[PDB]
Ligand binder design. Structure first.
Ligand SMILES: [Cl-]
Length: 108
């Protein structure tokens, strides 16, 4: 469904990554469930909000631990909605709001 809102991120689940990859994120040792932001597409809603290596732990105050968990929530929204995101930027536990202003109509 291309009309679904798009953030413009690629992801990896923490539970799927080797120990050495997780150590490079410099997140607290008690953060074991989450989604690493692997890349951000220019001009998409995540740009200027999230950053590469952020580790998302909640969306809309609901815990997420895999790319599919985030997709389930993101796709329950419509364009024009906003989401909250809780994430670790290194040791910093942060929250941000992102307005879902794009669809995937121009992505393939
Ligand atoms: Cl949140």
């Amino acid at each position: 469904q291309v009309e679904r809102p798009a953030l413009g991120i690629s992801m990896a689940g923490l539970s799927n990554l080797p120990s050495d990859v997780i150590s490079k994120l410099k997140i607290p040792s008690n953060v074991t469930n989450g989604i690493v932001v692997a890349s951000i597409q220019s001009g998409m809603p995540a740009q200027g909000k999230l950053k590469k290596y952020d580790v998302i732990t909640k969306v809309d105050d609901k815990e997420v631990a895999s790319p599919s968990d985030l997709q389930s929530l993101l796709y329950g929204h419509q364009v024009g909605d906003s989401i909250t995101v809780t994430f670790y930027r290194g040791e910093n536990k942060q929250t941000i709001t992102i307005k879902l202003t794009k669809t995937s109509k121009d992505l393939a």
